[PDB]
Design a binder for this molecule. Sequence first.
Ligand SMILES: *[C@@H]1O[C@H](CO)[C@@H](O[C@@H]2O[C@H](CO)[C@@H](O)[C@H](O)[C@H]2NC(C)=O)[C@H](O)[C@H]1NC(C)=O
Ligand SMILES: *[C@@H]1O[C@H](CO)[C@@H](O[C@@H]2O[C@H](CO)[C@@H](O)[C@H](O)[C@H]2NC(C)=O)[C@H](O)[C@H]1NC(C)=O
Ligand SMILES: *[C@@H]1O[C@H](CO)[C@@H](O)[C@H](O)[C@H]1NC(C)=O
Ligand SMILES: *[C@@H]1O[C@H](CO)[C@@H](O)[C@H](O)[C@H]1NC(C)=O
Ligand SMILES: *[C@@H]1O[C@H](CO)[C@@H](O)[C@H](O)[C@H]1NC(C)=O
Ligand SMILES: *[C@@H]1O[C@H](CO)[C@@H](O)[C@H](O)[C@H]1NC(C)=O
Ligand SMILES: *[C@@H]1O[C@H](CO)[C@@H](O)[C@H](O)[C@H]1NC(C)=O
Ligand SMILES: *[C@@H]1O[C@H](CO)[C@@H](O)[C@H](O)[C@H]1NC(C)=O
Ligand SMILES: *[C@@H]1O[C@H](CO)[C@@H](O)[C@H](O)[C@H]1NC(C)=O
Ligand SMILES: *[C@@H]1O[C@H](CO)[C@@H](O)[C@H](O)[C@H]1NC(C)=O
Ligand SMILES: *[C@@H]1O[C@H](CO)[C@@H](O)[C@H](O)[C@H]1NC(C)=O
Lengths: 88, 288, 50, 237, 199
Amino acid sequence: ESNKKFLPFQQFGRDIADTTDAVRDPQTLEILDITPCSFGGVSVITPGTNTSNQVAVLYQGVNCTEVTWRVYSTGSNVFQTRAGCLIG
Amino acid sequence: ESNKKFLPFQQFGRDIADTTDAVRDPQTLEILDITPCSFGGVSVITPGTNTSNQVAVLYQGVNCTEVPVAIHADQLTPTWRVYSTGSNVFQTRAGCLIGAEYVNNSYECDIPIGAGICASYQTQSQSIIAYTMSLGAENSVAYSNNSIAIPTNFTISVTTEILPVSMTKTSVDCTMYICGDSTECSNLLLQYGSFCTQLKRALTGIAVEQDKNTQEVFAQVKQIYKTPPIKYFGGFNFSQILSDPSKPSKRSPIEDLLFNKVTLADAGFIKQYGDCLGDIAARDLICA
Amino acid sequence: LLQYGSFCTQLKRALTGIAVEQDKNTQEVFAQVKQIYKTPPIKYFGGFNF
Amino acid sequence: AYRFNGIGVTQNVLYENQKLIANQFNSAIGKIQDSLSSTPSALGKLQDVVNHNAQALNTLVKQLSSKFGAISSVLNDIFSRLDPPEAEVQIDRLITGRLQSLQTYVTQQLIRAAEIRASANLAATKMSECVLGQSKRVDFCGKGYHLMSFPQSAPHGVVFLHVTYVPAQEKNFTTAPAICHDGKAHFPREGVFVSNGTHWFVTQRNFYEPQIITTDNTFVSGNCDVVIGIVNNTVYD
Amino acid sequence: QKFKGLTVLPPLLTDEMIAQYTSALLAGTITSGWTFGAGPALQIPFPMQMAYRFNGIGVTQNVLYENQKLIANQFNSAIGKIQDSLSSTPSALGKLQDVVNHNAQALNTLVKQLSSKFGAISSVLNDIFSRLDPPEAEVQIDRLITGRLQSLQTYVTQQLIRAAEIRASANLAATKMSECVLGQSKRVDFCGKGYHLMS
Ligand SMILES: *[C@@H]1O[C@H](CO)[C@@H](O[C@@H]2O[C@H](CO)[C@@H](O)[C@H](O)[C@H]2NC(C)=O)[C@H](O)[C@H]1NC(C)=O
Ligand SMILES: *[C@@H]1O[C@H](CO)[C@@H](O[C@@H]2O[C@H](CO)[C@@H](O)[C@H](O)[C@H]2NC(C)=O)[C@H](O)[C@H]1NC(C)=O
Ligand SMILES: *[C@@H]1O[C@H](CO)[C@@H](O)[C@H](O)[C@H]1NC(C)=O
Ligand SMILES: *[C@@H]1O[C@H](CO)[C@@H](O)[C@H](O)[C@H]1NC(C)=O
Ligand SMILES: *[C@@H]1O[C@H](CO)[C@@H](O)[C@H](O)[C@H]1NC(C)=O
Ligand SMILES: *[C@@H]1O[C@H](CO)[C@@H](O)[C@H](O)[C@H]1NC(C)=O
Ligand SMILES: *[C@@H]1O[C@H](CO)[C@@H](O)[C@H](O)[C@H]1NC(C)=O
Ligand SMILES: *[C@@H]1O[C@H](CO)[C@@H](O)[C@H](O)[C@H]1NC(C)=O
Ligand SMILES: *[C@@H]1O[C@H](CO)[C@@H](O)[C@H](O)[C@H]1NC(C)=O
Ligand SMILES: *[C@@H]1O[C@H](CO)[C@@H](O)[C@H](O)[C@H]1NC(C)=O
Ligand SMILES: *[C@@H]1O[C@H](CO)[C@@H](O)[C@H](O)[C@H]1NC(C)=O
């Protein structure tokens, strides 16, 4: 849902990079917003393979209350940092 | 008209950059020149718009009597034609300066202009004055072969020095920056080599180097000494530099003053995505 | 050329930065003191020849 | 007292002017604290450090709206309106332009990082010599004869509070390079022979303190007929 | 060069002003020793200042006070021979000559690069527009524009690197001005080869 005040002759919105931000539904003339769904970096923390094979995963800049391998689930080993959320 | 003598039936003439410079007319066998029409840089000298709206114009490498034919006058707007010859014209080695009045005095340099010439905004009726910068106050100590000078009193002074240490650590994602949501673009980009690996390595090196710089500057000692409970040092107090428990982060008052003075425009580090999407009307640069 | 953006202005900004830096270098090297002393009119210094 | 002994001033000067020195130091500290607030453009270095990154990121974001010679700056429109044979020809231009923009950003960042590293090395050297000891280099660790320094943390940098010693209130005297006594020249161990117009005294270098001439503070080393400008007077025992 | 959009700007400080700065530094040194760099300038005779400097290097005052004439003659001979050596050897100002030559050759290369084709059919935009129509004229125009932009970028990058090097050299020169001229240094081989006296 959007609250932008489109004038009657306008039907599109633009950002600094000239990418579409808001849009108006052709059938029901309401205003909507467009935002990409979430993404972020992933880092792996490990000792040398000469020592062990256990690793930890850090999700950078992600609050892990809403966090192809899904093997590293919670496991009661979820900790919150300022740089992300550590798991493992 | 061209005075370059030419071997006969020889038409063209080139320059250093290998471009046409002299031409021969086909009807009348006369040699001409194709020197470009007059041009040059334009610089605007202004104080802040918070103060006034008066400006001065500098014409680089142009003698002051050739400006009207150089800027193609008598066709521009009358506002632009005012900054033509008009009045109050001074000539420097850098070029012609129009709009400022030369002054025989000498002060410190405020706005550099050219070779020894500066400008400022003076009260004289506020106006713009151009002068010659002053090297400093004239002095002359008296030398003698049987005389010496010896001080009888001292002074304790405290100065300030500021030095940068580190910068901001950033990271970039090629696919998101270049292709965005498309996947065919990513498939095409998979054929351009290891540019992304190179950029990632460079940025990672810079990011590690910043932390190395901070450690080198601050982690000199390794024992955390504690301040004595009572503060008496023979009459000196250091309360302005020691920690204040009430103030945030156990910082000193001077440190708090510095941190309030520097406007850190990047709050960041708040793992903001839910609030990033929620408040669209903010148009936050960090979210963008 | 109008369809290329600030790629034609970044160069101007960098060149201006270098130009200002040159004057900063000269000022730091030579403007150590701001008092213009004058040499004595008589030039006898213990037999030294300046 | 050790630090005054470092720059060539005897301990008695501080041991007799302790209260004055303490008051002067306190006043200077208060004055600089007020001056930092008063002056608006003091921390231009750190402010520029912040502004450079802000401007670079803004320029990189703004560059995404260029066409680089194609028909549009949106990939989806090209994909929807053109067949692959021309879509590739239009798209390679955008890809190349964005790659060029990223390369320029990375190179500029590398150069700025080198500059910042040089500044950080200088700051580390100043922390080592100014704070952990007393420096003898001229104009290093402040303007004047160095006494000490203190570090303070700042955003993206550090601030140093140099404490120096400055002479004042000079006075003219008459000097001579040696003193003849019983046909023997006399040079001062540490000091300079000065006269007040009648009586000759030996005083220290950077603080007027007249002392009587005695064998303790002079050594003979030769004869009076060689030195130029020598003056004959009597030395006590 | 100016016909192609490249200009040279004059420096802010002129040669007369730089000479005035140098003369002020020399006069302050001669008439006051190092006192003018730490506070108000205090007068002192030159033989006494030289005695101060022998005391600094670790030689008693009597040595100068008894070999004044010989030391003065030696200094005069050395300062006289410096000019003859500089005039004779025509390779002394190599660093400054290279500083001039680098800029000259960089500008010459940038100017000469304007005659390249970059794979197009010609290096003349007017000829390209006069002989072709837009649909494939734009290809050649884009080729030429990209090549020239690449040339400008290379020039600017090299200029940035050289500016960094020059800044490092200027910082070293400022340090030498502060320590060798306004005082007497104790570092080895910093001021000169041996026990430093003046500069
Ligand atoms: C050396 O300078 C200090 C600082 O000015 C002098 O101390 C001041 O003396 C005047 C005159 O007696 C007083 O009014 C001030 O209160 C003193 N303190 C300050 C901070 O100004 C001191 O007298 C000077 N010494 C000599 C020998 O003149
Ligand atoms: C340390 O010196 C400073 C210099 O004035 C003192 O700071 C203030 O002193 C006034 C004088 O009474 C007090 O009213 C203030 O409360 C002090 N603090 C501030 C933030 O203004 C300080 O009192 C001195 N310390 C001691 C122990 O005397
Ligand atoms: C569009 O058509 C649908 C049915 O096809 C109808 O339910 C809807 O009300 C129509 N909207 C408008 C604006 O005519
Ligand atoms: C993470 O999300 C939870 C629930 O939305 C919230 O309570 C918590 O404050 C968040 N953590 C942050 C913002 O650091
Ligand atoms: C060119 O032709 C015209 C005829 O239109 C003639 O008048 C003129 O003299 C000719 N110029 C020459 C031959 O140089
Ligand atoms: C006046 O302008 C002419 C035009 O080229 C120039 O040649 C001349 O040197 C200028 N005069 C002065 C004094 O600069
Ligand atoms: C000292 O200075 C005076 C005045 O400048 C000069 O006449 C005299 O020759 C100098 N030397 C001596 C030894 O007096
Ligand atoms: C040294 O000073 C004298 C003045 O007595 C002058 O004649 C002479 O030329 C100077 N030395 C040199 C090498 O010029
Ligand atoms: C020393 O004597 C000179 C003589 O001209 C005088 O100008 C100078 O100020 C005197 N120094 C003083 C009074 O401290
Ligand atoms: C110089 O000092 C002597 C000490 O022997 C004293 O008798 C005389 O009054 C002093 N003169 C002046 C002008 O201070
Ligand atoms: C020093 O003593 C000698 C003889 O011992 C005398 O000739 C000379 O005049 C004395 N010095 C002065 C300045 O009078």
